[PDB]
Amino acid sequence: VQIVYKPVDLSKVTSKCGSLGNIHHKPGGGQVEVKSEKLDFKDRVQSKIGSLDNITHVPGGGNKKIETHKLTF
Amino acid sequence: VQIVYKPVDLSKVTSKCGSLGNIHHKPGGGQVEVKSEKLDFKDRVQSKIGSLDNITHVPGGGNKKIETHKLTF
Amino acid sequence: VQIVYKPVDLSKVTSKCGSLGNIHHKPGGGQVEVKSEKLDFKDRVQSKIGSLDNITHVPGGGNKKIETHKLTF
Amino acid sequence: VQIVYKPVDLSKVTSKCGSLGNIHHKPGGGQVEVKSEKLDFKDRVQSKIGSLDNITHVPGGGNKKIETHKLTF
Amino acid sequence: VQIVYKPVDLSKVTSKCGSLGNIHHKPGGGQVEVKSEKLDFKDRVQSKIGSLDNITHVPGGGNKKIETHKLTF
Amino acid sequence: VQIVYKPVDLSKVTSKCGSLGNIHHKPGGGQVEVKSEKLDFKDRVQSKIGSLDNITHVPGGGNKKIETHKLTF
Amino acid sequence: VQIVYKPVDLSKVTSKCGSLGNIHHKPGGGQVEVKSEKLDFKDRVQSKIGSLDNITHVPGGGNKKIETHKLTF
Amino acid sequence: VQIVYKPVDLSKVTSKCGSLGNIHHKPGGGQVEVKSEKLDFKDRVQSKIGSLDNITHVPGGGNKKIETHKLTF
Amino acid sequence: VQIVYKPVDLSKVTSKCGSLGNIHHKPGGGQVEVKSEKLDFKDRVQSKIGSLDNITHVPGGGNKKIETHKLTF
Amino acid sequence: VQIVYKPVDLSKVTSKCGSLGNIHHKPGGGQVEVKSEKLDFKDRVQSKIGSLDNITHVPGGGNKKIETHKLTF
């Protein structure tokens, strides 16, 4: 048997911004509490427990491009 | 048997912005509580327990493009 | 047997914005409580328990394009 | 047997905006409570339990385009 | 046997807006309560339990285009 | 002229409580707004403007006794 | 002229409590706003403007007794 | 002229409490805003402007007794 | 003219508490804002502007007694 | 003219407490802002501007007694 796999891609992902400006992010603080006797995790776990966070993700043009090229028998 | 797989793509993903401006995000704080005796997770778990977060995701043009090219027998 | 697979795509995804402006997002804080004795998760679970969050997702043109190209016997 | 699969697409998805303006989103806080003795999830579950959130998704032109190209025997 | 599959598409999805303006979304807070002894979910479940949320989805032109191209024996 | 003023009082004000118990007062938050150009107050004014309060007055027996003894010509 | 003023008082104000207990006061937060150009107060004013407060006044027996003994010509 | 002023008082103010207990006061945070161009106060003013407070006044028996003994010509 | 002023007082103010206990006061934080161009106060003013406070006044028996004995011509 | 002023007082202010206990006061932090161009105070002013405080006043029996004995012509 014969297989040919030549997927072509000629693509653009473009972002044009003149100016972002004055981003103000001032969060007031809260309170967080957790109480859990026994905890048992296994096999590829990614958890977040009792967390009070604040993020400001201001990329000056942040673009993604994902591809996946699978081939199996 | 014979297979040919030459999918072509010539695509644009464009964003044009003159100016974003003054984004104000001031959250007042809250309160969060959890109480759970026994916790048991397994096999590819991603959890969030008792979290008080605040995010400001202001990309200056944030575009996605996803493709998946699967081939199996 | 013979197969030919040459799907062509020449597509645009465009966003044109002159100016976003003054986005104000000021949430007042609340209260959240959970009490659950035993918790048992398995096999590709993504959960959110007892969370008080606030998000401001202001992309300056945020566009998606998704494709999936499957082929099997 | 013979198969030919050459679906062509030449499409636009366009958004033109002069200016968004002054979006005000000020939610007053509430209260949320949950009490559940035993919880057991399995096999591709994505849940949200006891959550008090607020989102402001103001893309400056946010457009989608989805395609799915399946072929099987 | 012979098959030919060349569906052509040359389509536009356009949105033209001069200006959105002043969108005010100020929700007063409520109260939510749930009490459920035993919970058991399986096989591709996506649930929301005891949630007090507020969303403001103001895309500056947000358009969709979906296609599905299936072929099987 | 002659005046005699000997008002006698031998009074009890009693409260007997065995046990108060579990008083739960969890108010959900609201929103309040006021807009008033010019405000002019004088001469023994006690006002409350634009206030979102919550009180829990649980005295373990709270009793009043008031008297006023006036005499004039 | 003659005046006699011998008001007698032999009074009790009593509170008997065995036990108060578990008083829970968890208020969810709200939002308050005021906008008033010109404000002019005079002569014994006590005001409250734009206030979001929470009080828990749990005296273990809180009793009042007031008297006023006036005499004038 | 003659005046006699011998007001007698033999009074009790009593509070008896066995035990107060577990007073929980957890207020969720709110948001408060005020905007007032010109402010002009005079002559014995006590004001509160733009305040987000929380009080827990738990006296172990807090009793008042007030008297006022005035005499004038 | 003759005046006699011998007001007698033999009074008790008593508080009896066996035990106060476990007072929990955990306030979540809020946000407060004020903007006022010109401020002009005079003559015995006591004000509070833009304050986010928290008080826990737990006297182990806190009692008041006030008297005022005025005499004028 | 003759005046006699011999006001007698034989009074108790008592507080009896067996034990106060475990007072927990953990306030979450907030945010406070003020902006006021011109400020002009005079004549016995006591003000508080832009203050984020926390007090725990736990006297082991804190009692007041006030008297005022005025006499004028």
Distance CA I56, CA J27 (A): 11
Distance CA A67, CA G29 (A): 45
Alpha helices in J10-62 (DSSP H): none
Please tell me which residue of chain E has the smallest CA distance to D24. Answer: E24
**Burial of D18 (C-beta count, 10 Å sphere; 0-12/13-18/19+):** middle
- Cβ pair A31:I28 closer than 8 A: yes
Distance CA I52, CA A29 (A): 12
Alpha helices in C1-73 (DSSP H): none
Q: Which of I47, I65, I70 to mutate to test the interface with J (most CBs of J within 10 A)?
A: I65
Please tell me which residue of chain B has the smallest CA distance to G31. Answer: B28
Within 10 A of A13 (CB to CB), how many other CB atoms are there? 21
- Cβ pair C50:B32 closer than 8 A: yes
Task: Name, in order, each residue with C-beta under 8 angstroms of H43's C-beta and a sequence gap of 6 or more.
Answer: G42, G43, G44, I42, I43, I44
Task: Name, in order, each residue with C-beta under 8 angstroms of H64's C-beta and a sequence gap of 6 or more.
Answer: G62, G63, G64, G65, G66, H13, I63, I64, I65, I66
Q: Using beta carbons and an 8 Å cutoff, which residues of E are at the interface with F?
A: 26-31
Q: Indicate the residue of B6, B33, B64 with minimum beta-carbon distance to C65.
A: B64
Query: Helix/strand/coil (H, E, C) string of I9-54?
Result: ECCEEEEEECCCCCCEECCCCCEEEEECCEEEECCCCCCEEEECCE
Beta strand residue intervals within chain F, DSSP E: 2-5, 8-9, 12-17, 24-25, 31-35, 38-41, 48-51, 54-57
Long-range Cβ contacts of J2-7 (<8 Å, 24+ apart): J2/I1, J2/I2, J2/I3, J3/I3, J3/I5, J3/I71, J3/J71, J4/I3, J4/I4, J4/I5, J4/I6, J5/I5, J5/I71, J5/J71, J6/I5, J6/I6, J7/H69, J7/I5, J7/I6, J7/I7, J7/I8, J7/I9, J7/I69, J7/J69
CB C20 within 8 A of CB C59: no
CA J48 → CA G45, G54, I49, I50, I53, distances in Å? 17, 20, 6, 8, 11
* Structure-token pair, residue A3: 């297989």
Within 10 A of E14 (CB to CB), how many other CB atoms are there? 12
- Cβ pair G28:D26 closer than 8 A: no
What are chain H's partners, defined as 3 or more CB pairs within 8 angstroms? A, B, C, D, F, G, I, J
Distance CA J46, CA H53 (A): 19
* Structure-token pair, residue G57: 């006044």
CB G62 within 8 A of CB I57: no
Touch criterion met for J and E (3+ Cβ pairs within 8 Å): no
- Cβ pair I26:A28 closer than 8 A: no
CB H42 within 8 A of CB I43: yes
Chain G residues close to C35, C-beta within 8 Å: none
Nearest Cα residue to F13 out of G69, I17, H60, G65: G65
> In the 8-state DSSP scheme, what is residue F28?
P
Chain D residues close to H30, C-beta within 8 Å: 28-29
- Residue-wise burial string across G1-17, b where 16 or more C-beta atoms lie within 10 A, e elsewhere: eebebbbebebbbbbbb
Nearest Cα residue to B28 out of A28, I26, J30: A28
- Cβ pair I28:B26 closer than 8 A: no
SS3 A27: coil
Q: Using beta carbons and an 8 Å cutoff, which residues of H are at the interface with C?
A: 26, 28-31
Distance CA H68, CA J70 (A): 12
What are chain E's partners, defined as 3 or more CB pairs within 8 angstroms? C, D, F, G
- Cβ pair J28:B26 closer than 8 A: no
- Cβ pair E26:G28 closer than 8 A: no
- Cβ pair I30:C31 closer than 8 A: no
Q: What is the dihedral of CA F15, F20, F26, F31, to 10 degrees?
A: 0
- Residue-wise burial string across C58-68, b where 16 or more C-beta atoms lie within 10 A, e elsewhere: bbbbbbbbbbb
Within 10 A of C43 (CB to CB), how many other CB atoms are there? 16
CB E5 within 8 A of CB E71: yes
Q: Using beta carbons and an 8 Å cutoff, which residues of F are at the interface with E?
A: 26, 28-31
Distance CA G40, CA E28 (A): 32
* Structure-token pair, residue E68: 């599905």
Distance CA H20, CA I60 (A): 11
Q: What are phi and psi of D18, to 5 degrees?
A: -75, -45
* Structure-token pair, residue E18: 């001069």
Within 10 A of I21 (CB to CB), how many other CB atoms are there? 21
* Structure-token pair, residue H10: 């033999």
Touch criterion met for E and A (3+ Cβ pairs within 8 Å): no
Chain B residues close to C19, C-beta within 8 Å: 17-21
Residue with tokens 């010539």: B10
| Helix%, strand%, coil% for chain B, nearest 5 | 0, 45, 55
Alpha helices in chain B (DSSP H): none
Q: Indicate the residue of H17, H25, H27 with minimum beta-carbon distance to F60.
A: H17
Task: Name, in order, each residue with C-beta under 8 angstroms of A50's C-beta and a sequence gap of 6 or more.
Answer: A32, A33, A34, B34, B49, B50, B51
Please tell me which residue of chain G has the smallest CA distance to C32. Answer: G28
Please tell me which residue of chain G has the smallest CA distance to B28. Answer: G29
Nearest Cα residue to E16 out of I62, D15, C29: D15
CA G26 to chain C, closest CA, distance in angstroms equals: 8
CA E40 to chain F, closest CA, distance in angstroms equals: 30
Distance CA A4, CA A15 (A): 35
SS3 D20: coil
CA A70 → CA B6, B65, C8, C68, C71, distances in Å? 14, 18, 20, 12, 10
CB C9 within 8 A of CB C67: yes
CA C38 → CA B18, C41, E7, distances in Å? 52, 10, 54
**Burial of J39 (C-beta count, 10 Å sphere; 0-12/13-18/19+):** middle
Distance CA G7, CA I36 (A): 54
Residue type, D6: K
- Cβ pair C62:B62 closer than 8 A: yes
- Cβ pair E60:C17 closer than 8 A: yes
Distance CA H45, CA H33 (A): 22
Query: Helix/strand/coil (H, E, C) string of H41-71?
Result: ECCCCCCEEEECCEEEECCCCCCCCECCECC
CB B12 within 8 A of CB A9: no
| Helix%, strand%, coil% for chain A, nearest 5 | 0, 45, 55
Chain E residues close to F25, C-beta within 8 Å: none
Which helix (H) or strand (E) segment is B7 a member of? none
CB E42 within 8 A of CB D46: no
Distance CA E26, CA E33 (A): 22
What single string gives the DSSP state of each residue in E38-54?
EEEE-SS---EEEE--E
Distance CA D41, CA D39 (A): 7
Chain G residues close to D26, C-beta within 8 Å: 31
- Residue-wise burial string across A37-73, b where 16 or more C-beta atoms lie within 10 A, e elsewhere: eeeeeeeeeeeebbebebeeebeebbbeeeeeeeeee
Please tell me which residue of chain I has the smallest CA distance to H54. Answer: I54
Nearest Cα residue to B25 out of A62, D57, I52, C18: D57
Give the experimental resolution in Å.
Answer: 3.5
> In the 8-state DSSP scheme, what is residue B60?
S
Alpha helices in chain G (DSSP H): none
Chain J residues close to I65, C-beta within 8 Å: 11, 13, 64-66
Distance CA J57, CA I57 (A): 5
Longest CA pairwise span in chain E (Å): 65
Distance CA I19, CA I13 (A): 19
Nearest Cα residue to F51 out of G52, D34, A36, C60: G52
